[PDB]
Amino acid sequence: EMVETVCGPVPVEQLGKTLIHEHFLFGYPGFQGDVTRGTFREDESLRVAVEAAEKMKRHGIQTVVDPTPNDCGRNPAFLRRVAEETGLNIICATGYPYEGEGAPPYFQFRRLLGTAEDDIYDMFMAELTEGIADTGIKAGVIKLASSKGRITEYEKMFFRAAARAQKETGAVIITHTQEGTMGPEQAAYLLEHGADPKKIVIGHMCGNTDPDYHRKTLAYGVYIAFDRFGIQGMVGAPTDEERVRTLLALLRDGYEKQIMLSHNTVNVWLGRPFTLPEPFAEMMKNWHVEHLFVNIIPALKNEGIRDEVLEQMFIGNPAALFS
Amino acid sequence: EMVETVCGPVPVEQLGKTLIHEHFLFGYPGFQGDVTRGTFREDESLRVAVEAAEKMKRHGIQTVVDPTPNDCGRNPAFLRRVAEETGLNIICATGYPYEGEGAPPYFQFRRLLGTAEDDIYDMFMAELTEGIADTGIKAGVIKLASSKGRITEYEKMFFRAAARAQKETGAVIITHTQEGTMGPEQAAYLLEHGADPKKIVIGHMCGNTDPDYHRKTLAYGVYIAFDRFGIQGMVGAPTDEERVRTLLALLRDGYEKQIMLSHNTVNVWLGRPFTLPEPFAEMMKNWHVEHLFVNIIPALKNEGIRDEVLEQMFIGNPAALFS
Ligand SMILES: CCCCCC(=O)CC(=O)N[C@H]1CCOC1=O
Ligand SMILES: [Fe+3]
Ligand SMILES: [Fe+3]
Ligand SMILES: [O-]
Numbered sequence: 001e002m003v004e005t006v007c008g009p010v011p012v013e014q015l016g017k018t019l020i021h022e023h024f025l026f027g028y029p030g031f032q033g034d035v036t037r038g039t040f041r042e043d044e045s046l047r048v049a050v051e052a053a054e055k056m057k058r059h060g061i062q063t064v065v066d067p068t069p070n071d072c073g074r075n076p077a078f079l080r081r082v083a084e085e086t087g088l089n090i091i092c093a094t095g096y097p098y099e100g101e102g103a104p105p106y107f108q109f110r111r112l113l114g115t116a117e118d119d120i121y122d123m124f125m126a127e128l129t130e131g132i133a134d135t136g137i138k139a140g141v142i143k144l145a146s147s148k149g150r151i152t153e154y155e156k157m158f159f160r161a162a163a164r165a166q167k168e169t170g171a172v173i174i175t176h177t178q179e180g181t182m183g184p185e186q187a188a189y190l191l192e193h194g195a196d197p198k199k200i201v202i203g204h205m206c207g208n209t210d211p212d213y214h215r216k217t218l219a220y221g222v223y224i225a226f227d228r229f230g231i232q233g234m235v236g237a238p239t240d241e242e243r244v245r246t247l248l249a250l251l252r253d254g255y256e257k258q259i260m261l262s263h264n265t266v267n268v269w270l271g272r273p274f275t276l277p278e279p280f281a282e283m284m285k286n287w288h289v290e291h292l293f294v295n296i297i298p299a300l301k302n303e304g305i306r307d308e309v310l311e312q313m314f315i316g317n318p319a320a321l322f323s
Numbered sequence: 324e325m326v327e328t329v330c331g332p333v334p335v336e337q338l339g340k341t342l343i344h345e346h347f348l349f350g351y352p353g354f355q356g357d358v359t360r361g362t363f364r365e366d367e368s369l370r371v372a373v374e375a376a377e378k379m380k381r382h383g384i385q386t387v388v389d390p391t392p393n394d395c396g397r398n399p400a401f402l403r404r405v406a407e408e409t410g411l412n413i414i415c416a417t418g419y420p421y422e423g424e425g426a427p428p429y430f431q432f433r434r435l436l437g438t439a440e441d442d443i444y445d446m447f448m449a450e451l452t453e454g455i456a457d458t459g460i461k462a463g464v465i466k467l468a469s470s471k472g473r474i475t476e477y478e479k480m481f482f483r484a485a486a487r488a489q490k491e492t493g494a495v496i497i498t499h500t501q502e503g504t505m506g507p508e509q510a511a512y513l514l515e516h517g518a519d520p521k522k523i524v525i526g527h528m529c530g531n532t533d534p535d536y537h538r539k540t541l542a543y544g545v546y547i548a549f550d551r552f553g554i555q556g557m558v559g560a561p562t563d564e565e566r567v568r569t570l571l572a573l574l575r576d577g578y579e580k581q582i583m584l585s586h587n588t589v590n591v592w593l594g595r596p597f598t599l600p601e602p603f604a605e606m607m608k609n610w611h612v613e614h615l616f617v618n619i620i621p622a623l624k625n626e627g628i629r630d631e632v633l634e635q636m637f638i639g640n641p642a643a644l645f646s
């Protein structure tokens with residue numbers, strides 16, 4: 001009935017229109033060592049974050065889930081300044097990135113000692129039920145991630161921990177899948193360990209353009225997220241055209257109570273600034289929090305999709321997810 | 324004539340007896356995501372770090388090189404509090420850990436963009452000549468590391484950047500070798516790119532018990548460090564008895580002006596505390612900052628090593644290295 005946000009418990013009935021996967025801040029593990037040339041600029045990162053919040057608000061969004069992993073710049077007090085300022089509900093995560101874009105040494109060492117999976121459980125339970133650091137903020141979701149073509153033995157520790165914490169807390173799990181692989185594998189493995197499919201979102205499912213792969217994942221009763229709209233031409237991601245063609249096929253099959261959409265924006269990169277070459281930079285040009293509402297959703301409406309299907313995905317599914 | 328310490332420039336001639344490789348603070352990358360259960364207890368860490376400084380001072384140590392990589396908990400202002408309190412000279416580093424036990428994603432991302440090597444050079448130059456973060460502390464050494472049996476292409480970026488920053492600054496390079504591999508490879512590749520052998524310390528050389536490999540490395544004119552005394556069992560490392568037999572062989576061969584000794588201690592672990600399982604726990608019991616003076620040097624003196632040779636290793640070589 002309630003979900004923990006960066007501003008404390010909010011009734012699930014009041015979450016409203018929700019973007020299921022956006023980052024206000026994100027840094028790739030390793031950004032911490034580049035502090036000298038990549039200092040966190042708090043005032044300017046707040047104004048950009050707050051502006052992103054305002055743009056989402058102009059398209060009706062009342063709630064963002066920000067699943068930034070723990071060592072990737074997750075900053076609950078920062079998110080609370082965004083939420084206090086804009087009135088947006090923001091739900092944060094507890095979780096670690098996949099091995100390929102992570103820093104596994106800390107928990108690999110604890111796996112050597114035989115305490116890793118229990119330690120991850122402990123962290124999940126502390127941040128879900130007591131709070132993150134001294135912020136007073138509980139994560140509302142557990143974030144999981146797997147590698148391309150594999151859920152590594154390291155990653156499996158987090159999956160089992162997440163299942164155990166879900167059984168005890170009822171917390172929503174949100175996953176990352178790499179390059180359109182392991183959707184069905186994630187669902188089956190979470191279910192193996194007693195996780196509840198009604199509380200699981202298998203993410204980055206737009207990374208795969210075969211509706212059969214999607215159906216194999218949906219068959220577990222989990223949600224799937226087409227959560228990378230705008231990301232085109234980079235690290236294996238397909239085009240928004242193929243995302244839409246895949247989604248339309250799922251919607252015409254009646255799967256809208258299982259689908260949620262997002263962009264996976266990074267509104268403020270942590271570490272040193274960068275610029276993409278315009279081959280990439282012009283194809284990444286629609287990767288912003290308004291893209292679903294200015295480019296994608298209208299196109300869907302012009303291909304048959306009704307308002308009540310959109311409301312199911314943006315409003316009904318989050319409400320069901322968190323309750 | 325001077326080297327930058329955590330308390331500013333210190334004349335090289337006053338460095339005195341020096342431990343070339345110890346960590347006051349250290350965490351494995353990823354420790355940052357365990358902030359809730361693994362928070363940094365700064366007042367107790369200072370107490371522990373200062374006591375370690377006092378134990379080292381009790382055996383005549385005036386200077387410690389602390390080569391904690393940038394994303395491994397390097398904390399110049401903390402080290403300065405240690406140095407201010409104890410009068411110990413503390414020299415810190417700029418650098419990143421090797422691929423195996425690091426967080427490669429951040430600079431892998433910039434390598435894809437084509438700026439990584441230059442960015443690493445910029446970082447080295449900024450931390451060597453302007454200051455780390457806002458601490459006002461310059462690193463006095465570049466810290467490099469390679470993987471087991473390979474200097475990876477990612478690692479090679481840092482080697483090349485370090486040679487470039489050495490050419491411009493004359494700064495000392497201190498390396499990590501993994502499991503007794505790549506000693507000769509590191510020296511040759513650094514020299515290939517114009518680095519100065521008299522400013523390079525090839526570390527963790529005690530990981531290899533074959534004096535032919537040490538001689539292969541010393542042939543480049545670099546320093547080598549037997550810098551993990553007390554580490555037994557873990558990370559495949561040899562025993563201290565094996566360390567002493569290899570050392571004694573090179574000393575009886577006349578290589579004292581190329582050799583430095585240290586323990587690579589971690590006086591305060593970052594992240595969540597841990598207890599070593601009793602097997603490793605007993606083998607690791609000598610891994611503390613007094614071990615060389617209390618156990619190793621006595622055995623060496625029993626074996627005929629004279630005080631002048633020890634003074635060469637502890638005083639003469641650090642002075643030559645930094646001068
Ligand atoms: C405008 C900046 C574009 C560069 C971002 C990029 O490289 C694409 C990408 O990997 N996606 C980002 C988003 C979330 O985590 C990632 O890895
Ligand atoms: Fe994401
Ligand atoms: Fe070390
Ligand atoms: O992500």
Ligand SMILES: [O-]
Pocket residue numbers: 499587
């Ligand atoms: O080390």
Ligand SMILES: [Zn+2]
Pocket residue numbers: 499500527
């Ligand atoms: Zn090392």
